[PDB]
Amino acid sequence: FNITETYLRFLEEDTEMTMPIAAIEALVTLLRIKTPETAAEMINTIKSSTEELIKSIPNSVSLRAGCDIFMRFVLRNLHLYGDWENCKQHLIENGQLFVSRAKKSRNKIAEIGVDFIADDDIILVHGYSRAVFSLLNHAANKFIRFRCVVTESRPSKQGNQLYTLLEQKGIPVTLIVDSAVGAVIDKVDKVFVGAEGVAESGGIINLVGTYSVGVLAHNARKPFYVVTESHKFVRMFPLSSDDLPMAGPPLDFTRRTDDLEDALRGPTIDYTAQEYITALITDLGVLTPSAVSEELIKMWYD
C-alpha cells in the first residue's frame, strides 16, 4: 500500500496541514488494513516500514519524530486493559482526528500567541515554518502596526518564495543578505525563527544559517525566538558544535578542480545551543525553559 507513495501525493498543493500530520495519517492508513488486533504481526511491520522510510529519506527530519510519537500514542492506548476491538477502533479514529487537531492547534497559536508584535516591533524572520506565517497573516487581520525584515535564504531560492507570500497580504518588505546581518541589529527589535526540529538538549535543528544569527542576538541582547507546532521533538543529541545526523555532507573538502563544478556543498543544516532561546511558542501552553526535555521524559518514562 506504501507510505512513500502517500507522501509523494501532496507537492504543489500542501500549505495547510502539517507534514508530520500527513505522515501520521499515512501510517494510520497503512495500519487499518492488516488487522491491528495482533501486536506480533503489526508493530514489527510498522517499525520495518519506518526504517524503510528513513532509508529512503532525501532531506527530512520530522518524519522520525512523528512516527515515534505515533508509536508512543499506540503504547499509551493499550493500558486500559479492557477489550481489543474498542481500543483498536479508537486508535483507528485517532488518525484523522489527529489531523483535525492540528488545525485547532494552529488556530489557538494564531489567536493567543501573537502578542509579541504590537508596538511597531520590527521582526527578523528566517527559516520557513507555516505556523509563523499563519501568525503573521492572522496578525494583519487585527490591524496592528508592524514591520518585516527578510534575511535571504538560499537552499534553492526559498527567500524569493517567502517574499512572494508576503506580497499577497500587501505588506512593506526589504531584503537583507546574511553577511550584512551583523551590521543591522539597531532598528530591528526581535529575531523570530521557524525550526525543522527541537533537540533533546533544548537546541534548535534548522536550515542554511541560524547559529551565527543566534550568536549575533546573544551579542546584541535582543531576544531570540522560535515558533513551531508542538510535534517536533526527536530523540537526537547534537553533542558538539558541528555534528548532526545529516543526509548531506558535513563540510567536504573537494579536490583541486578546474572547470568550477564542485563548490556548492555548504552547510544547509545548522544547530544552536540551548541557552539562546528566550521564548518558544507552542500550542500546548506557553512553555520554554526546559519544557521539551520534560515532555520527552514524560513520553519515555526515563
Partner: protein, 355 residues
Amino acid sequence: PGISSVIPTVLEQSFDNSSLISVKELLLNKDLIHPSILLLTSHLAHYKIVGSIPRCIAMLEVFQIVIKDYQTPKGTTLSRNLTSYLSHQIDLLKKARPLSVTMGNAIRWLKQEISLIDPSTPDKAAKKDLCEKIGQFAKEKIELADQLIIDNASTQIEESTTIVTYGSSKVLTELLLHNAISLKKNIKVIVVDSRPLFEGRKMAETLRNAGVNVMYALITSLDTIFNDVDYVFLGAHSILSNGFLYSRAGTAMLAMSAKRRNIPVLVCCESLKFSQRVQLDSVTFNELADPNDLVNIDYENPVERRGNKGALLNQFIKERKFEKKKLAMENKPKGNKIGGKKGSEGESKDASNEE
C-alpha cells in the same frame, strides 16, 4: 569514647565551616565495634584510587557483610541498639572522611528497609531475604545503569576521535577501555593529572595495561596541547537541585578552556546521585583535608626530600590550604549521560521527584 581535639597546622582566615582534622593511629575506643568499619575508615582516610563511583558500592558491600555477621541478642529485639550502632558508625565515618550524597542515599535506603520489616520475624529467614533484596537493588540501579550509559556512549562516538580526559572515575575508565577493546576505532587519549590525588596517573597506568596511544599532561600545560583535538570528558560526583556540577578538583577550568576553544564538554552521571540540598558555591560545604598531601616535591608520592619546605606550625602567618570538591558552572557542560539515555543538565531534579 573515642578521641577529641588536637589539630595539626594553621586554621587559616578564610574557608572555615567543614571538618578538616581525628584518628589516624588508633588509641582507646569502645569495645563493641566491628573491625571492618574501622578498616574501611582507615582506607578511605588514606585512599588514592576511589572517586565517587566505587565508594558507595564498597559501603554497600561492608553493610552486607555486617548483616551476614549480625546476630540478634536473646533479650532485646533485632532493632533496639542496632540504630545506635549505625549512628556510631556514621559518626566514625564523618570523623574519618565526610559522607557523600551517594552514601546519604544508601543510608536513607537502609532506614527505609528497617522501617519496612517490623520486629516480629525470626533471624535466619529475615536477613536471608534482606541480603538478596539488597543485592538485587545493587544489580538494578548501579551496574545495569552503568552498562546502559556505556552503550549510550558507544552510539554517540563517531569516526576519528582525539579526547582529553580527567579523573579516577570508574565509568570513564570502563568507557575508554571499551573503546580500546571492542569498538576498534581511531581513539586517542590525553590525560590530565592533579596534585591532591594521583588519579590521572592511575588512568594512564590502566590505559597502558590495555595498550592505548597515550599523551600525558597537567593543569598548567593546556595552551600548547590543542595546537585536531575535539572531545572533552569529565567525571561528576553529584548534581544538585540548582543544576550546577558539584564534582572533584580540576574540572571546571578544563571545561572553561574547552568552551573558549570552540568544542563543548560532555559529563557522565548516575540516576541516584541527585540531591535536594541547595548550594551554588564551594564555600558552603567542601571536602577539606590535611596539608600533608601538598608536601612531596613532584616526581612520585614516596620520595621524601629535604629541600626548601617542611614546616607548618613553626611558621609565623602562613596559610597552606587546598580544596578537593568544586562547584562548576551550569552552562558550560552540554551533554549529560544518565539513566534516561540523553538530556540537559538544566533538568536538575526531574529524577528526584520521580524517585
